[PDB]
Design an enzyme around this catalytic site. Structure first.
Site, PDB file in Angstrom:
ATOM      1  N   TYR A 121      24.344  70.805 -45.664  1.00 24.87           N
ATOM      2  CA  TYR A 121      24.783  70.486 -47.015  1.00 24.87           C
ATOM      3  C   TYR A 121      23.942  69.422 -47.647  1.00 24.87           C
ATOM      4  O   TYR A 121      24.137  69.225 -48.837  1.00 24.87           O
ATOM      5  CB  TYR A 121      26.139  69.915 -47.074  1.00 24.87           C
ATOM      6  CG  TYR A 121      27.268  70.899 -47.050  1.00 24.87           C
ATOM      7  CD1 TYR A 121      27.480  71.726 -45.974  1.00 24.87           C
ATOM      8  CD2 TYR A 121      28.020  70.985 -48.187  1.00 24.87           C
ATOM      9  CE1 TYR A 121      28.467  72.659 -46.069  1.00 24.87           C
ATOM     10  CE2 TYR A 121      29.007  71.931 -48.299  1.00 24.87           C
ATOM     11  CZ  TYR A 121      29.206  72.751 -47.228  1.00 24.87           C
ATOM     12  OH  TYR A 121      30.140  73.764 -47.389  1.00 24.87           O
ATOM     13  N   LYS A 168      29.450  73.281 -32.292  1.00 31.67           N
ATOM     14  CA  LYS A 168      28.730  74.401 -31.680  1.00 31.67           C
ATOM     15  C   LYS A 168      27.510  73.757 -30.970  1.00 31.67           C
ATOM     16  O   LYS A 168      26.331  74.072 -31.187  1.00 31.67           O
ATOM     17  CB  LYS A 168      28.328  75.374 -32.808  1.00 31.67           C
ATOM     18  CG  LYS A 168      27.741  76.673 -32.205  1.00 31.67           C
ATOM     19  CD  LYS A 168      28.764  77.608 -31.615  1.00 31.67           C
ATOM     20  CE  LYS A 168      27.930  78.585 -30.833  1.00 31.67           C
ATOM     21  NZ  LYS A 168      28.748  79.569 -30.131  1.00 31.67           N
ATOM     22  N   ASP A 222      33.423  78.662 -32.223  1.00 30.25           N
ATOM     23  CA  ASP A 222      33.853  80.032 -32.335  1.00 30.25           C
ATOM     24  C   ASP A 222      35.166  80.306 -31.603  1.00 30.25           C
ATOM     25  O   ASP A 222      36.049  81.049 -32.047  1.00 30.25           O
ATOM     26  CB  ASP A 222      32.733  80.927 -31.825  1.00 30.25           C
ATOM     27  CG  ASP A 222      32.154  80.810 -30.424  1.00 30.25           C
ATOM     28  OD1 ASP A 222      32.526  79.945 -29.616  1.00 30.25           O
ATOM     29  OD2 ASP A 222      31.296  81.644 -30.156  1.00 30.25           O
ATOM     30  N   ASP A 245      34.341  73.113 -43.509  1.00 31.15           N
ATOM     31  CA  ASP A 245      34.501  73.999 -44.670  1.00 31.15           C
ATOM     32  C   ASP A 245      35.180  75.334 -44.305  1.00 31.15           C
ATOM     33  O   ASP A 245      36.118  75.815 -44.953  1.00 31.15           O
ATOM     34  CB  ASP A 245      33.120  74.227 -45.241  1.00 31.15           C
ATOM     35  CG  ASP A 245      32.986  75.161 -46.458  1.00 31.15           C
ATOM     36  OD1 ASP A 245      32.184  76.091 -46.402  1.00 31.15           O
ATOM     37  OD2 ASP A 245      33.645  74.980 -47.478  1.00 31.15           O
TER      38      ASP A 245
HETATM   39 MG   LIG Z   1      35.117  75.306 -48.936  1.00 25.83          MG
HETATM   40 MG   LIG Z   2      30.260  83.718 -29.810  1.00 28.06          MG
END
Ligand SMILES: [Mg+2]
Ligand SMILES: [Mg+2]
Lengths: 414, 414
Positions: free
Chosen positions: B158, B228, B281, B305
């Site tokens: 961002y 992640k 995830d 987000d």
């Molecule tokens: Mg958003």
């Molecule tokens: Mg995966």
């Protein structure tokens, strides 16, 4: 050099784009770490039962064990997590299936799963998620989900171009950015990790083309490009533009009018496929709220990783979710869950994921019947409520079977 | 210079970390584009009703309209989407609330919402999502969700450091990478967009500290760092390590043994807050499958987000979801949905988001009672099934009210 390639059996062959599969093909399988040791035996057994049933003895698979991950260090020695011959062997024999894989921490060794995908340029991670009637779901109407994810596997932030905070390297590229690129946008340039997110035109057009072709070939209703391009203009916003562009230039896409959506006529059914986009945060809502609105999904590497997992949870199939990584020269079908070491050897986990990935394999080889038998067996067993512990916890009335036994339950309902 | 600052009213003041709020404070509000024109009148009305009820006439808010987005071009002229005095005015008066904002395409103008957040260094995007009893939900057990998201607002992808495919700039930084950094990892270096993802130690420790403090102050049960980091080691994997480290160094975090999880004793209640991580995830699955396991969530900018939107859909509140962007010197409460232009002026959309963001505002100012009255009014109206079109579609038995009317329904249940 430690693989024992079968005496009976013949390689699959690639004769210009099309696969020439023998009746006794050698398929390589990577057993898998952890629960691979349980789930894989269950899949060789049910695939064998499904090709014996379908082709009445004519065809038989010659399985050839190859090594990656933890079992490879017990075969080639401690340092070899990914032997170079597994890459030659998959490449050679064209299709392979694997179980869950342990990547070690502490060793500077990047994801072994991602490693297979980038090393062999398997640029399509294809993850189908649909509801199997009777599996327990967190949502009210999981039957409305039937989507196919085309996730790009070779670029995005997954390329692994990054440098440590306070490293020399990191200090050097931050200097180049601020001094030579004139970037006045890093809030804290000191103690700062740096990652590179590449998104090329070739990389996205080859994935979008596979996505629309799949839509034509199974005449699916639409292709949704998801992205976060309002914030990332030149990587993710480039991806939705390159995908609309390929729909217009190569598939004769036309505005549903006013824009931005495109119609593509399926040359075979006469039906129109709508080509649309939704921004990725809104998408994660729209799959929960209006699942019937969506079908084939094309998206970049991080977003497809999240979208798959999310869609898989909702239909209640985080342990029966199949997948494939497909490139031009070969394919690797895989169980999409982890190695679960606490359960390994206990014969109790769900073999449903790696099994449904072998129906994707069987289907890909053109052994469509064998394959339709595995999904027949799957709906049979689940509907029988003849299920493994993970499903039974959440169901009233079920009979608990072990892993090996749900193998056999799939064979009984064939 | 086009704002008319109220004759009666006094600025809030920041007296070393703590806010000194007068009884007649001037709060700036940005009306909002699109449906801002509907939702905002509804919020001034119910906040006014809630501070008149609570403090029996003693306190009153002096509202001061300031401009951003489309209405700003109709006030300062066509080119000014974000006037420089909106930044001085928010900074000055300390707390402000806004409605949905239109950012124009075609103009090279980056997100106006993100612009306010980076410009005024509002590094905490705080999004609370809990279920209001009786709202229609896609999931079976939305009552199990009660989470608070601490999303970092000032770095990650961002930051907006990116260059166009085939641009000179892009050609230059790809050359630096391949030639001077020795990167042999971009699959297609030709026709390739490039984005930069920064993650610094200061940026994540200030957000994680706000997260754990919020947990202590409202004695919440845990803080989950999501990331992640197995794929992104030096930006997202740096974030989970810097957050465990701050829990150990500044909050006296101790292993729940064996690692990796930490216990933090709340100095006030005696209770332990567990500090844990889940990979992003799997997290998107775990919020659907085991929501009760989670509470306060700390995470970087892109992931938060997505996590917000997803959590908001499940509890059935994509139109009644509040938020805040908080920094050290000021705060901006906002409706978290878009401008919906097709409905603008029709008085029909749900004012619930911007309203519940004013209870966050009222709460932040210490006007806790006014604030508890707004959530009393909210549960009252929804439970009355005296609801707006979006909720009514999905409910049997409801009475459909307009936007302005659900304003009044919130006042009746106070
Ligand atoms: Mg958003
Ligand atoms: Mg995966």
């Amino acid at each position: 050099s430690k693989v024992v390639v079968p005496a009976q059996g013949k390689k699959i062959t690639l004769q210009n784009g099309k696969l020439n599969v023998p009746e006794n093909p050698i398929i390589p399988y990577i057993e898998g770490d952890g629960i691979g040791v349980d789930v894989t035996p269950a899949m060789l057994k049910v695939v064998d039962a499904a090709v014996e049933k379908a082709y009445k003895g004519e065809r038989k698979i010659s399985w050839m064990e190859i090594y990656t991950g933890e079992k490879s260090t017990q075969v080639y020695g401690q340092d070899v997590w990914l032997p170079a011959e597994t890459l030659d062997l998959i490449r050679e024999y064209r299709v392979a299936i694997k179980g869950p894989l342990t990547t070690p921490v502490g060793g500077g060794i990047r994801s072994l799963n991602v490693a297979l995908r980038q090393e062999l340029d398997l640029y399509i991670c294809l993850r189908p998620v649909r509801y199997y009637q009777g599996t327990p779901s967190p949502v009210k109407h999981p039957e409305l989900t039937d989507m196919v994810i085309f996730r790009e596997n070779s670029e995005d932030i997954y390329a692994g171009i990054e440098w440590k905070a306070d490293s020399a390297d990191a200090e050097k590229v931050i200097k180049f950015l601020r001094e030579e690129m004139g970037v006045k946008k890093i809030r804290f340039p000191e103690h700062c990790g740096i990652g590179i997110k590449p998104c090329s035109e070739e990389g996205t057009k080859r994935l979008v083309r596979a996505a629309i072709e799949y839509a034509i070939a199974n005449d699916r209703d639409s292709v949704t490009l998801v992205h976060k391009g309002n914030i990332m203009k030149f990587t993710e916003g480039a991806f939705k533009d390159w995908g609309y562009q390929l729909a217009r230039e190569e598939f004769g896409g036309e505005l549903i009018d006013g824009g931005p959506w495109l119609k593509v006529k399926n040359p075979n059914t006469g039906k129109e496929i709508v080509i649309k986009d939704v921004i990725a945060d809104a998408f994660l809502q729209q799959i929960l709220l209006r699942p019937a609105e969506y079908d084939v999904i094309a998206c970049m590497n991080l977003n497809g990783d999240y979208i798959s997992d999310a869609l898989a949870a909702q239909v209640g199939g985080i342990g029966i979710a199949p997948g494939a990584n497909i490139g031009d020269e070969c394919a690797l079908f895989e169980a999409t869950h982890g190695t679960a070491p606490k359960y390994a050897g206990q014969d109790k986990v769900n073999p449903g994921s790696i099994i449904l990935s072998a129906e994707m394999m069987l289907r890909h080889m053109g052994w469509t019947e064998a394959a339709d038998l595995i999904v027949k067996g799957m709906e049979g067993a689940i509907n029988a409520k003849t299920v493994t512990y993970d499903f039974e916890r959440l169901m009233d009335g079920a009979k608990l079977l072990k892993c090996s036994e749900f193998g056999d339950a799939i064979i009984e309902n064939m």
